[PDB]
Amino acid sequence: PRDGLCYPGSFNDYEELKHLLSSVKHFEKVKILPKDRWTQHTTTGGSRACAVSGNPSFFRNMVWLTKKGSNYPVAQGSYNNTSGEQMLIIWGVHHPNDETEQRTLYQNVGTYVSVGTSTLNKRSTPEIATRPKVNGQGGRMEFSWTLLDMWDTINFESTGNLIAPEYGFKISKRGSSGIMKTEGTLENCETKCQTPL
């Protein structure tokens, strides 16, 4: 696929996530952390790697937290799963190219991005290093995911380099499915057995 991660980076347990979708037939997006509540931080941050119409932009479902008025207070974020079914949540960590980028974007060094649920406990820290430029950007964005169970709570805590999510992907329909690796296009037709050919 040509359109993957517009901002260079990786996706932890990406192959496992594609295996989960093989038994999921429908997602009902739920706004778990609206962009408006981040009133103590700047949420308009964008990159040329995500440019649309010649202007910097960013992923639609993710929020790039940034310093507001030369201040970066601790990012508090929580959501209690009340959607009635298991919900998939994706967050990310930003790795600046150099320590100067760290200062001009978050102003705090040695920041942490921690995510905790009733069954998950993770703390991540940015890795500042010199890397070859991909899509013109020297930084990287590492994205991680988890499944939030019934009536469970997920807490987001970070002093910097947190790409907080805005929407959760609630599973609604489950059943037999799969992924076709094909370059064809959908056509008006009906069948009971589909092959890539």
Chain residues in the site for a second copy (CB under 8 A): 10, 95, 114-118, 121-123, 127, 129-132, 134, 140, 142, 152-153, 155, 157
Tokens of 33: 């952390």
The one of ligand NAG, a second copy, none whose footprint includes residue 121, by CB under 5 to 8 A per kind, is a second copy
Q: Cβ distance 126 to 160 under 8 Å?
A: yes
* Shortest distance (Å) from residue 53 CB to a second copy: 27
- Our finding on whether 1 is near ligand NAG (CB under 6 A) is no
By C-beta, is 37 or 173 nearer to ligand NAG?
Answer: 37
| Residue 10 contacts which entry, ligand NAG, a second copy, none (Cβ below 5-8 A, type-dependent) | a second copy
- Residue closer to a second copy by CB (options 54, 132) is 132
**Which of the listed partners (a second copy, ligand NAG, none) does 155 bind, with a CB threshold of 5 to 8 Å by partner kind?**
a second copy
Comparison of 83 and 137: residue with beta carbon closer to a second copy: 137
For residues 85 and 152, which CB has a smaller minimum distance to a second copy in the complex? Answer: 152
Kindly state the number of chain residues that form the binding site for ligand NAG, as judged by CB under 6 A: 5
Amino acid identity, residue 195?
T
Task: List binders of ligand NAG among 80-99 (CB under 6 A).
Answer: 80, 82
Question: Which residues face 75 on adjacent strands?
Answer: 158
3-state secondary structure at position 45 = coil
> In a 3-state reduction of DSSP, which class is residue 102?
helix
**Pick 19 or 122: Cβ nearer a second copy:** 122
Total count of residues recorded for the chain: 197
Query: Considering the rule CB under 6 A, would residue 151 count as an interface residue with ligand NAG?
Result: yes
Evaluate whether 86 touches 149 at the Cβ level (below 8 Å).
Answer: yes
Measured from the CB atom, is 38 or 156 closer to a second copy?
156
Q: What would the two tokens of residue 77 be?
A: 């974020």
d(CA 55, CA 52): 6
Given a contact cutoff of 8 angstroms between Cβ atoms, the answer to whether 72 and 159 are in contact is yes
Q: Which residues of 71-93 are buried (b: 16+ CB within 10 A; e: fewer)?
A: ebeebebebebebeebbbbbbbb
Q: From the centroid of its chain, how far is CA 103?
A: 23
Given the rule CB under 6 A, which residues bind ligand NAG?
80, 82, 132, 151, 153
